[PDB]
């Protein structure tokens, strides 16, 4: 959420009576609330080394944000004219979103003061000028009230100038550990979000996102370089829309996580699990033999907890195939719902060291992947070969073992 402003006031450097609060909204708020303009007056109107900077300090239980501005010209008295649009917030908040708005407001009023002296002539006092060669209070009222109510304003101050402030939330930057073996999901419908302003790559990535395409597969399908796909996926993560996942095989080591009790403690997880994992009709895949009407929630919970750290998906499916045939359960959707709800995870396979003649580039990237202890997934993606061929190539290259972590 956005913190409401507590008190806005406009300081100015009078060349005779010093720094003072010219206008303040709400009126007499600082004196009523205990804020005194005699302790931090040296930061609001500072010496010209701290000027044109976003000064922010803490006063008691109130955090004070300001952008002092000093203009140097011989027209003004004492060759200087200093003011400050000061924003006061309670300390226990986050003043991050208002900081660019305060900086831009100070910069805009500095530009207007340098252009046509909009803020110096508004005092109606010739003591601010050399003398030898619009209401601020209403503007403060409108700024305070519009930023408290709407978080936006289109406040006019002249015939061609307007205070246009919009407050945006601050978002965390995305991860950098995204690779070619991670499949991107899409928690939002990316078809209706596309408009004319999108990146050309990000237009092409959207159709090939269904929870089963690897990033290199998306890059090859859409004729894209993997780096720009990485950047576009990072941008989609930045808006909290796309979450990475794992390539689904039948040789995976899927295991229950510590959130397997969420399948009982969430009232809306198992009910969607019944409808999600079921084929639309009586599919023929639920009629093949092992060798030659919706599912019960208890059956699904027993099937989730049947996985273990070392039982591959082939062994689990050939050990439990009557249950997944009578209930008409799609095994890929069954695994994908568990992975999406973070109730089961995947134990990755690591080929740590102790056939057709492949090319020199293939063996070079194989050695580079082995030296960095990369998983079987990344080697399979880079070589465009399945697990058995990679294992045979590695066994021809040297002795090695698999770690299921």
């Amino acid at each position: 959420g956005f913190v409401p402003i507590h008190t806005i006031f406009y300081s100015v450097f009078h060349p005779t009576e010093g720094s003072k609060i010219k206008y303040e909204f709400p009126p007499n708020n600082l004196k009523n609330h205990g804020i005194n303009f005699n302790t931090f007056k040296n930061y609001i109107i500072p010496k010209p080394i701290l000027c044109h900077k976003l000064i922010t300090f803490k006063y008691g239980t109130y955090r004070i944000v300001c952008y002092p501005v000093t203009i140097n010209s011989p027209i003004y008295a004492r060759n200087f004219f200093s003011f400050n649009f000061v924003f006061v917030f309670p300390y226990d908040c986050e003043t991050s979103p208002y900081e660019p708005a305060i900086t831009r407001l100070g910069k805009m009023f500095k530009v207007l003061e340098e252009q046509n002296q909009l803020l110096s002539k508004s005092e109606r006092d010739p003591v601010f000028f050399d003398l030898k060669v619009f209401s601020i209070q209403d503007l403060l009222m409108r700024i305070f009230q519009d930023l408290n109510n709407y978080s936006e304003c289109l406040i006019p101050i002249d015939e061609g100038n307007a205070v246009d402030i919009k407050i945006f939330p601050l978002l965390r930057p995305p991860t950098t550990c995204v690779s070619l073996e991670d499949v991107p999901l899409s928690s939002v419908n990316l078809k209706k979000i596309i408009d004319v302003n999108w990146d050309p790559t990000m237009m092409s990535i959207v159709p090939y996102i269904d929870g089963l395409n690897s990033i290199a597969k998306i890059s090859k399908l859409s004729n894209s370089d993997p780096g720009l796909v990485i950047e576009c996926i990072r941008h989609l993560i930045y808006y909290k829309c796309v979450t990475l996942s794992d390539i689904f095989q039948f040789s995976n080591i899927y295991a229950p996580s510590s959130l397997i009790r969420n399948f009982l403690t969430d009232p809306l997880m198992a009910s969607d699990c019944q409808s999600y994992v079921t084929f639309p009709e009586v599919s023929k895949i639920s009629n093949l033999p092992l060798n030659k009407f919706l599912p019960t929630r208890s059956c699904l919970f027993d099937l989730y907890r049947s996985l273990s750290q070392g039982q591959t998906l082939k062994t689990w499916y050939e050990s439990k195939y009557m249950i997944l045939k009578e209930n008409n359960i799609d095994i890929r959707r069954f695994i994908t719902f568990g992975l999406e709800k973070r109730i089961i995870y995947r134990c990755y396979s690591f080929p740590v060291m102790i056939m057709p003649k492949l090319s020199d580039e293939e063996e070079g990237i194989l050695e580079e992947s082995i030296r960095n202890a990369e998983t079987f997934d990344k080697i399979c993606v880079l070589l465009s070969k399945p697990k058995l061929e990679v294992e045979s190539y590695l066994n021809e290259l040297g002795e090695f073992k698999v770690i299921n972590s």
Partner: protein, 509 residues
């Protein structure tokens, strides 16, 4: 019915934490909607002790205004601003899927929302991007009317009560009056203000009378049929006025300040003349500033007489939702009289309660997981009950809040002040085998109509346990009946000593 409401004519103050910047009232007079950045809260006025129904919609920007739909055929529609879009809610749906359709007009934040009093399915929205849009609920795809001031952000939009296609908008220090037949060119641009215009309003019975508030403490009354400039009347106060609205009964107007004053709503009789403010009644209280004030209506169903009584609902920044009764002296000082004959019968609204959650191949019927244990223990119920002040101990709700705060280790399974049902769990040393160990109980409580007034005690019912013998059950029930029978003779509240005794902490006499 409205005439069996226990909170009309009595001063009551809620406590709704969360920073709600909007409020609106059901025209039936039972529900109140509150808008925040997280969504909506719907509160039953007749039973404030029930926790509010929560509809989820998370937005970063603060909501501007909310308005209940006055259309009698659809009393389940609530329109609230969500930054640049307006959301028409549906209370008949689920709590998590209450959004029906969203108006995708404008380009910046929506500022105010008002309904047409003559055509209750026509909606007007004003926004910060100088656009005033008129919507239709039958085809909510595009606006059928668009107009702008091109200079300043709008602040309020209001329809004309008499002329159905005249709407006014306030844009800074200048207020415009648009006409749907003409469009984009105002009938009159009333320019008499010095500071910005905060509120705009229309007279209910007058055709062309307009009242606006201002930041410089000037309330100016207009009659734009005579002259666009100047004002018919000007009232000067000592504070900026945030919302100034006409009285619904008689001749008068009520104004309140954004800052300054005593943070109270001032009521002024109305029976070119600059003058000073002379209020009749000031609703003293509300230590922080007031967000909005609402009017609650209550009249007979098929009668032809203006016998309605009015209550004022104020929502303020201090998280207090107060109810202000209106005495007969206010009905006398303001020119309000009970009409012997009515030209038109008043509209009749359905007096429903939109607070309880509605009920909502082929699946097989089963009980996958036990409902108990999956339950979340109601600790928000005690906090909600601690913030209701009707008129030491006053009613059942304050007693339940007091025993909830006094014993944090007593888990409440079911709290219902309105139906006098109270099911709670505790652990107590009541085993004939080992007195040191504790036995889990699920004691349910039923209260009569007059719980502390008469000598009638609560009737305690305890669910059966194999750990609890018949002798212990009889002893506990007889002792609780003795405590309730003895302790209501002084007309006090017997729920603290009963729970303390069942917990085994002490003995009282």
């Amino acid at each position: 019915g409205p005439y069996n409401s226990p909170t009309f004519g009595k001063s009551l103050s809620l406590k709704v934490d969360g920073g709600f910047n909007a409020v609106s009232i059901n025209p039936s007079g039972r529900d109140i909607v509150l808008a925040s950045r997280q969504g909506l809260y719907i509160i039953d006025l007749d039973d404030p002790f029930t926790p509010p129904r929560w509809l989820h919609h998370i937005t970063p920007w603060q909501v501007a205004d909310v308005q209940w739909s006055p259309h009698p055929a659809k009393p389940y529609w609530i329109v609230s601003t969500s930054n640049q879009k307006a959301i028409i809610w549906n209370l008949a749906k689920s709590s998590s899927n209450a959004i029906e359709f969203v108006l995708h007009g404008h380009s910046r934040a929506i500022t105010d929302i008002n309904f047409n009093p003559q055509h209750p399915d026509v909606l007007a929205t004003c926004s910060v991007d100088t656009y005033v849009h008129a919507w239709d609920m039958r085809s909510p795809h595009r606006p059928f009317y668009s107009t702008s001031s091109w200079r300043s952000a709008a602040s309020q939009v209001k329809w004309n009560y008499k002329d159905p296609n005249v709407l006014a908008s306030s844009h800074g220090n200048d207020i415009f009056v648009w006409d749907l037949r003409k469009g984009s060119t105002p009938l009159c641009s009333l320019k008499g203000h010095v500071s910005s215009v905060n509120s705009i309003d229309f007279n209910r019975f007058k055709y062309s009378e307009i009242m606006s508030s201002s930041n410089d403490g000037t309330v100016k009354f207009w009659d734009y049929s005579k002259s666009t400039t100047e004002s018919k009347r000007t009232v000067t106060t000592n504070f900026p006025i945030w919302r100034g609205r006409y009285l619904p009964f008689g001749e008068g107007y009520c104004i309140m300040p954004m800052v300054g004053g005593n943070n109270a709503v001032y009521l002024i009789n109305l029976c070119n003349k600059k003058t000073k403010l002379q209020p009749i009644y000031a609703f003293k209280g509300h230590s922080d500033r007031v967000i909005d004030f609402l009017w609650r209506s209550r009249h007979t169903c098929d009668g032809d007489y203006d016998d309605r009584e009015f209550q004022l609902v104020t929502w303020s920044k201090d998280c207090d939702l107060k109810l202000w009764p209106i005495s007969d002296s206010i009905y006398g000082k303001v020119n309000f009289d009970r009409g012997k004959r009515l030209e038109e019968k008043l509209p009749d609204y359905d007096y429903c309660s939109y607070n309880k959650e509605p009920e909502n191949f082929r699946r097989l019927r089963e009980n996958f997981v036990t409902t108990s244990g999956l339950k979340k223990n109601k600790t928000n119920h005690i906090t909600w009950l601690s913030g209701i002040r009707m008129n030491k101990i006053q009613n059942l709700g304050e007693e339940v809040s007091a025993i909830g705060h006094k014993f944090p280790k007593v888990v409440f399974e079911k709290i219902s002040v309105s139906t006098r049902e109270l099911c709670l769990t505790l652990n107590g040393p009541w085993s004939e085998e080992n007195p040191d160990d504790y036995i889990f109980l699920r004691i349910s409580i039923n209260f009569p109509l007059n719980y502390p007034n008469k000598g009638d005690p609560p009737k305690f019912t305890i669910e059966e346990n194999s750990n609890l013998t018949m002798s212990k059950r009889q002893e506990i029930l007889s002792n609780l009946a003795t405590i309730g029978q003895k302790y209501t003779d002084s007309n006090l509240y017997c729920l603290e000593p009963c729970i303390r005794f069942v917990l085994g902490e002490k003995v009282s006499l």
